[PDB]
Automatic annotation (TrEMBL), chain B:
<feature type="binding site">
    <location>
        <position position="40"/>
    </location>
    <ligand>
        <name>Zn(2+)</name>
    </ligand>
</feature>
<feature type="disulfide bond">
    <location>
        <begin position="37"/>
        <end position="59"/>
    </location>
</feature>
<comment type="similarity">
    <text>Belongs to the eukaryotic ribosomal protein eS27 family.</text>
</comment>
<feature type="disulfide bond">
    <location>
        <begin position="40"/>
        <end position="59"/>
    </location>
</feature>
<dbReference type="GO" id="GO:0000028">
    <property type="term" value="P:ribosomal small subunit assembly"/>
</dbReference>
UniProtKB/TrEMBL annotation, chain C:
<dbReference type="InterPro" id="IPR029064">
    <property type="entry name" value="Ribosomal_eL30-like_sf"/>
</dbReference>
<dbReference type="GO" id="GO:0003723">
    <property type="term" value="F:RNA binding"/>
</dbReference>
<keyword id="KW-0687">Ribonucleoprotein</keyword>
<dbReference type="GO" id="GO:0003735">
    <property type="term" value="F:structural constituent of ribosome"/>
</dbReference>
<dbReference type="InterPro" id="IPR022991">
    <property type="entry name" value="Ribosomal_eL30_CS"/>
</dbReference>
UniProtKB/TrEMBL annotation, chain E:
<feature type="binding site">
    <location>
        <position position="78"/>
    </location>
    <ligand>
        <name>Zn(2+)</name>
    </ligand>
</feature>
<dbReference type="GO" id="GO:0003735">
    <property type="term" value="F:structural constituent of ribosome"/>
</dbReference>
<feature type="binding site">
    <location>
        <position position="36"/>
    </location>
    <ligand>
        <name>Mg(2+) 2</name>
    </ligand>
</feature>
<dbReference type="GO" id="GO:0006412">
    <property type="term" value="P:translation"/>
</dbReference>
<dbReference type="Pfam" id="PF01283">
    <property type="entry name" value="Ribosomal_S26e"/>
</dbReference>
TrEMBL record, chain H:
<dbReference type="InterPro" id="IPR002674">
    <property type="entry name" value="Ribosomal_eL43"/>
</dbReference>
<dbReference type="InterPro" id="IPR050522">
    <property type="entry name" value="Ribosomal_protein_eL43"/>
</dbReference>
<keyword id="KW-0687">Ribonucleoprotein</keyword>
<dbReference type="Pfam" id="PF01780">
    <property type="entry name" value="Ribosomal_L37ae"/>
</dbReference>
<dbReference type="InterPro" id="IPR011331">
    <property type="entry name" value="Ribosomal_eL37/eL43"/>
</dbReference>
Length: 33, 85, 96, 143, 104, 52, 115, 89
RNA sequence: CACCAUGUUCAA
RNA sequence: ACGGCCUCUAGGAAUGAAGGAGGGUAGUUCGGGGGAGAACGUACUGGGGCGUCAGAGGUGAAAUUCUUAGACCGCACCAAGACGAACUACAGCGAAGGCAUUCUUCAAGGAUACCUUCCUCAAUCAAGAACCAAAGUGUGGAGAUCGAAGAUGAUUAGAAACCAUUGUAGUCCACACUGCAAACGAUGACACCCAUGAAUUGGGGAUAACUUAGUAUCUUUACGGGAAUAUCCUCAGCACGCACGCGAAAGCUUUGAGGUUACAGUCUCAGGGGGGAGUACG
């Protein structure tokens, strides 16, 4: 390892999970309006 | 024991090695020379770091060639350093 | 270094000499014998160019074949219009 | 050149002498030095070139030390000063040449970057000359 | 966490250059910057001592007066392969500054 | 046969004297691949990509 | 002279001088281009006015090689200069007489003879 | 004052035919209706008079080139190649 | 260089 | 140099040129800096030509795979697209991103040199502007290699992973977008001071606090009064081991992270316990 404790999942994959979540939310609002 | 360097009056050896603008009082490195043309046989004053085309009045032959630093005098010509002042 | 020098002489002529712009005025100077130099753009029509060279040959007037077109020749003279032919009638301090 | 626009830290420059008196071997009169300055100017030479030729081939290290006047001052007094200041003229010429090259070479992004620096330098220089009234108001470099 | 090496494990000072084109590791093919990869120029004999003796005996060309050809190879390894192949080993902290400028 | 290899041509005669049958539509051209003097033939790249 | 076209592929190496103390002997680029031009001029001059037979003799006997290094050392101190590869890239139309003139007296072959 | 934000000349089509087909057509439409430099006579006076046909209002020369521009980049490459091969011969 | 996964909650 | 008639005659009185900035000239310097064009180089793959015959490939071991309809291998070629090995360095260039065959070209750029010019024109910067690796997007090309997705074969309790054989989008080019990097020296820009040894790149110069304290080597009929070394000096650049001092320490050290509670050279950006979160809304 080259980093300290993440205290969570790997930050790159957490960022991707957030990115997919943002895409889903903006799609749901689009279908609503 | 040896002589301690004085900042206000540096020694000859210390001052001579310094860059012209790093001396205690800045000054030129260049000078002027009397050059006798090998073809015109005439005296012309030439800058030691001439970058332009210096030619003899008579022969119209180039008296020197520009370089990165000091100008190079053509073969045959005789040069004499003129006094700085 | 084909254009840089002649542009400098053109600037000196433009400042301290006497010149004429256009084929018709240039031909008039050649007929009068007052022309000292004729400059021709590279996009001059072949029949017009040949007429100018023939006039210059008869009058023994030097010709310079400019490396630019009429737009470049006008700009080199400091004008905002094109010129096919330039005739210098007084060289001024240019030495051209 | 050195420091503005490009983090160069070069120090090359002239080092003017402390003693300003013309050397004793220089027998040329001040009125003749003025004549050569005007004569060189009429041949189209810029003030920078005029000084270098006098320095290289006439033994005149400093026109000001010989005549009391700078070369540009002599030209201004004789009505031979350039319409555009020398440094502005050369910067404008470089910008025009670079634009001429870029007209064909549209992917020379380094030249485009250097052109931005040159034109920025021109506009700052123009601002100074208009302030000191060496340029007419409403002078504007046009790309 | 902590800066292990002053040069960061490569020969690229901070104001020397931006990017060094990477090379493929000699063993695994991993792309590593050329200034970082462990470089070794190896001059290997084509044959070991016993086989070279037998071939030289059968050769009218090769013998005491004419040497056999060798293999010349520039081998650049990624850090992992260099360590795993023992071309280079982890060293004590005080010994990490020891550099060699010629093959010993 | 008089045109150098690598040149870009159009209005190409498929047969000598046919007065132009190949590379005629707008923006099209043929590329001269090579000359073979032994058989007196010329190889071309037609606009479609085929060699003829 | 007989219409053979060849490519020459010369390679040279810089060397330190006898009293040199520097850690490298890298060459100035302007000298490298000067070395390239002199090599190109010499090779073209020497090989363009001779036949393929004489050209091969020059190459295989190193006459051109010694000429190149002798005249190129004053430009740049060279550890060694050599022609690493020569390849014929274009041959003229076949000529039986020229081939026979190249081979001179042909040694007989006994392969087809009875044992 | 500016009458359209981005449509430009394509505003004659209203809301029809789609944004991307309009944008792609616009680039070629502006080119085909624009004035182009004439190497003869040194003027910006070349206008299209049919697909592939260009006439200069200045010198009245007619030149065959380009469906929507005076000269195509392929023609520029071909011009240099022919000049180079001509010198080589 | 086949394949080695896991260890309940506090507190000694 | 001396003398002499006539004509013209506001014309020399302005601090200085910053070891601040901008220009100029020069070697026609220096460099994997940038753009354009023409060529070269083997290699990967493929194709026939010419030979051979039973395997080849791949792995920890295998299988997917190829193969008497001739694979693999051998020789010389041809085609196409990439790439520029060794040399390649605690080396160079560039504002950063980045940049490596040769030749011919087009504009630049820094450094050095100068008794050239000039005269405060500067430093740093909200707003605004241009550029910006890879991946990704659009339209045309191109498509050899590698290869997200996918397919097959292994491994495994499972393995839709790592390994093997493949393979789409891509990878390459033109034009137009995107402006998300550990875009790092995790270290803002300008300026000043600062001890020591050995190197390196580029350009020049020389061979009672003291009045001046050397030195060569090799090549040498045309990019040649040349080229490189040697000793010394110098300015500019990337750095190394090395005294203060500093720091929580690791470490930094004229290349500061030093010159700071003995706290003030100038400007500017960001931070105020950890999460929620660079999320929600606009
Ligand atoms: N180049 C000529 C100049 O025109 C000047 O006059 C111009 C200005 O007074 C004024 O120009 C303004 C300018 O003040 C202001 N700072 C910027 C503005 N864009 C200019 O406006 C000008 O340019 C825009 C497009 O560029 C045109 O749409 C507009 O019609 C035109 N007036 O309008 C005139 C333009 O025709 C002055 N006469 C003088 O500076 C000089 O002669
Ligand atoms: K390393
Ligand atoms: K980093
Ligand atoms: K450097
Ligand atoms: Mg670890
Ligand atoms: Mg952290
Ligand atoms: Mg003293
Ligand atoms: Mg700056
Ligand atoms: Mg660690
Ligand atoms: Mg590293
Ligand atoms: Mg740098
Ligand atoms: Mg980077
Ligand atoms: Mg033997
Ligand atoms: Mg060196
Ligand atoms: Mg436990
Ligand atoms: Mg100054
Ligand atoms: Mg085969
Ligand atoms: Mg190479
Ligand atoms: Mg600033
Ligand atoms: Mg990309
Ligand atoms: Mg389509
Ligand atoms: Mg594959
Ligand atoms: Mg970011
Ligand atoms: Mg930095
Ligand atoms: Mg950061
Ligand atoms: Mg350098
Ligand atoms: Mg240090
Ligand atoms: Mg403070
Ligand atoms: Mg907080
Ligand atoms: Na093959
Ligand atoms: Na076969
Ligand atoms: Zn590896
Ligand atoms: Zn026209």
């Amino acid at each position: 390892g080259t980093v300290s404790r993440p205290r969570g999942m790997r930050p790159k994959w957490h960022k991707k999970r957030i990115k997919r979540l943002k895409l889903r939310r903006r799609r749901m609002r689009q279908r609503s309006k | 024991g040896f002589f301690d360097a004085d900042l206000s009056y540096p020694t000859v050896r210390t001052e001579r090695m310094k860059h012209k603008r790093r001396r205690l009082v800045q000054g030129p490195n260049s000078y002027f020379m009397d050059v006798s043309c090998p073809r015109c046989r005439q005296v012309t004053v030439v800058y030691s770091h001439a970058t332009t085309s210096v030619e003899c009045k008579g022969c119209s032959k180039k008296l020197c060639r520009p370089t990165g630093g000091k100008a190079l005098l053509v073969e045959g010509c005789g040069y004499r350093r003129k006094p700085d002042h | 270094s084909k254009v840089d020098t002649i542009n400098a002489k053109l600037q000196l002529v433009m400042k301290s000499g006497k010149y004429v712009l256009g084929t018709q005025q240039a031909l008039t100077t050649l007929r009068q014998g007052r022309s000292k130099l004729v400059v021709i753009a590279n996009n001059c029509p072949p029949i017009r160019r040949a007429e100018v060279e023939y006039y210059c040959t008869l009058s023994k007037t030097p010709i310079h074949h400019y490396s630019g077109n009429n737009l470049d020749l006008g700009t080199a003279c400091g004008k905002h219009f094109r010129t096919c032919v330039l005739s210098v009638t007084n060289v001024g301090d240019s030495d051209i | 050149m050195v420091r503005m626009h490009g983090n160069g830290r070069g120090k090359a420059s002239s080092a003017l002498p402390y003693r300003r008196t013309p050397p004793a071997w220089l027998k040329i009169a001040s009125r003749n030095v003025v004549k050569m300055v005007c004569k060189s100017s009429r041949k189209g030479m810029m003030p920078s070139q005029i000084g270098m030729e006098l320095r290289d081939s006439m033994g005149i290290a400093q026109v000001k030390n010989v005549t009391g006047r700078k070369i540009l001052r002599i030209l201004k007094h004789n009505g031979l000063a350039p319409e555009i200041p020398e440094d502005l003229y050369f910067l404008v010429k470089r910008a025009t040449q670079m634009r001429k090259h870029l007209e064909r070479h549209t992917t020379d992004r380094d030249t485009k970057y250097r052109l931005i620096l040159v034109e920025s330098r021109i506009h700052r220089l123009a601002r100074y000359y208009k302030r000191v009234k060496q340029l007419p108001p409403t002078w504007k470099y046009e790309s | 966490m902590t800066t292990k090496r002053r040069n960061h494990g490569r020969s690229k000072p901070a104001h020397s250059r931006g990017r060094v084109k990477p090379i493929h590791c000699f063993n695994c093919g991993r792309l590593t910057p050329k200034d970082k990869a462990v470089g070794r120029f190896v001059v290997r004999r084509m044959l070991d001592a016993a086989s070279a003796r037998d071939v030289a005996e059968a050769s009218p060309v090769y013998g005491a007066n004419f040497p056999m050809p060798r293999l010349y190879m520039k081998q650049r390894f990624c850090i992992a392969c260099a360590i795993h192949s023992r071309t280079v080993r982890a060293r004590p902290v005080g010994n990490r500054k020891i550099r060699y400028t010629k093959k010993v | 046969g008089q045109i150098t290899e690598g040149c870009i041509v159009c209005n190409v005669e498929a047969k000598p004297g046919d007065r132009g049958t190949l590379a005629r539509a707008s923006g099209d051209y043929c590329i001269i691949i090579s000359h073979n003097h032994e058989t007196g033939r010329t190889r071309l790249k037609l606009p479609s990509g085929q060699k003829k | 002279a007989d219409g053979y076209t060849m490519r020459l592929f010369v390679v040279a190496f810089t060397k330190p001088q006898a009293n040199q103390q520097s850690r490298n002997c890298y060459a100035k680029q302007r000298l490298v281009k000067w070395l390239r031009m002199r090599i190109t001029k010499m090779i073209k001059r020497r090989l363009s006015k001779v036949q393929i037979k004489e050209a091969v003799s020059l190459l295989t006997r190193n006459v051109l090689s010694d000429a190149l290094v002798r005249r190129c050392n004053p430009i740049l101190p060279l550890r060694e200069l050599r022609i690493r590869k020569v390849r014929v890239v274009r041959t003229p139309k076949f000529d039986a007489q020229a081939l026979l003139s190249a081979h001179g007296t042909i040694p007989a072959s006994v392969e087809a003879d009875q044992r | 004052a500016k009458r359209t934000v981005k449509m430009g000349v394509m505003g004659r089509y209203g809301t029809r035919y789609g944004a991307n087909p309009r944008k792609r057509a616009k680039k070629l439409e502006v080119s085909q209706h624009a004035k182009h430099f004439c190497s003869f006579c040194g003027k910006f006076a070349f206008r299209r008079k049919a697909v592939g046909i260009w006439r200069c209002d200045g010198c009245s020369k007619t030149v065959a080139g380009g469906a929507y521009t005076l000269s195509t980049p392929n023609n520029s490459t071909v011009r240099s190649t022919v000049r180079r091969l001509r010198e080589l011969a």
